[PDB]
Amino acid sequence: DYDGSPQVAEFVSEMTRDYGFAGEQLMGLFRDVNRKQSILDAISRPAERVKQWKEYRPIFISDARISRGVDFWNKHAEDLARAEKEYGVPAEIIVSIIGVETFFGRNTGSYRVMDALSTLGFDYPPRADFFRKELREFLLLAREQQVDPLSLTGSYAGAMGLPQFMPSSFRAYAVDFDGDGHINIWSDPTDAIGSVASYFKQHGWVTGEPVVSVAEINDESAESAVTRGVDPTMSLGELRARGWRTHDALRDDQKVTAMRFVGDKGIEYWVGLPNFYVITRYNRSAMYAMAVYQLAGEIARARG
Numbered sequence: 001d002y003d004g005s006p007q008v009a010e011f012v013s014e015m016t017r018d019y020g021f022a023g024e025q026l027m028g029l030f031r032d033v034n035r036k037q038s039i040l041d042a043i044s045r046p047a048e049r050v051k052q053w054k055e056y057r058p059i060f061i062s063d064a065r066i067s068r069g070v071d072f073w074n075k076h077a078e079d080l081a082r083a084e085k086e087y088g089v090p091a092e093i094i095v096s097i098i099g100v101e102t103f104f105g106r107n108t109g110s111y112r113v114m115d116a117l118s119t120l121g122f123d124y125p126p127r128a129d130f131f132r133k134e135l136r137e138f139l140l141l142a143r144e145q146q147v148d149p150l151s152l153t154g155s156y157a158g159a160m161g162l163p164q165f166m167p168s169s170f171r172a173y174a175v176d177f178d179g180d181g182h183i184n185i186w187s188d189p190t191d192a193i194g195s196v197a198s199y200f201k202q203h204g205w206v207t208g209e210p211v212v213s214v215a216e217i218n219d220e221s222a223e224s225a226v227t228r229g230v231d232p233t234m235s236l237g238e239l240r241a242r243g244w245r246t247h248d249a250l251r252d253d254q255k256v257t258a259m260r261f262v263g264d265k266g267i268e269y270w271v272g273l274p275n276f277y278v279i280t281r282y283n284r285s286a287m288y289a290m291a292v293y294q295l296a297g298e299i300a301r302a303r304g
């Protein structure tokens with residue numbers, strides 16, 4: 001497959017030139033790497049019908065998902081208490097991220113990271129440059145952990161372990177959280193716990209600030225302020241000047257988003273506060289962040 005590709009040889013040339021790898025051994029690795037046809041079909045898929053909150057929320061706030069989230073919390077309560085004390089990130093949020101990303105380990109990943117990132121970085125032009133950056137960080141992270149690169153698994157796009165970190169997030173955020181010398185986000189829940197918290201804190205999480213606020217609108221023209229995407233463009237003072245009223249009497253000066261969900265029992269208006277934006281840094285989706293925030297609430301409810 002990648003035995004003698006020109007681009008593969010030019011990737012190995014940059015690896016031995018900017019990061020000091022041994023080209024010969026590096027090209028012995030790529031001889032054992034498989035091009036995954038199923039990955040190409042997956043990422044070649046076109047626009048997939050986005051779901052209404054009415055249908056999206058019940059997929060992730062299920063009795064099974066919550067129940068297993070309390071078990072996960074019970075089992076690692078001491079590491080979660082440690083992560084929340086050191087990083088200022090709520091424990092229910094950490095559990096909820098892991099429960100949403102992998103269902104607490106049930107869906108860690110079906111492909112070898114080396115296959116996924118190679119297939120993409122060398123056989124998918126639209127984002128090849130991106131997935132060759134991740135391939136590079138992955139070879140770097142496999143060297144740092146002294147693990148062998150073919151033993152690591154992940155999603156079709158190369159997200160790894162319980163928190164589904166892509167290689168670059170692994171190198172920049174993952175932490176050795178039980179003091180044993182390794183960073184094992186695949187099967188060491190302690191490192192998963194600490195790694196998610198390090199991610200959130202380093203993406204701007206403010207400890208003690210609320211995440212979301214229920215909102216009302218004075219007029220249907222205020223729906224023109226619904227945020228297209230997850231990037232805020234106004235302060236809360238702006239949005240309120242547009243006809244949005246938050247039940248919470250929160251300060252004006254802060255960047256917010258405005259959301260209109262078609263919920264279980266009618267239209268739902270939400271204002272996403274900065275911390276809510278930190279959740280979307282994990283996956284650029286308004287419904288994702290809402291499912292994570294509410295799931296963390298259900299699990300904290302059921303745990304007591």
Ligand SMILES: C[As](C)(=O)[O-]
Pocket residue numbers: 159163164165166167168169170281282
């Ligand atoms: C896909 As990620 C949580 O490493 O940005």
Ligand SMILES: [Ca+2]
Pocket residue numbers: 175176177178179180181182183184188191
């Ligand atoms: Ca560790």
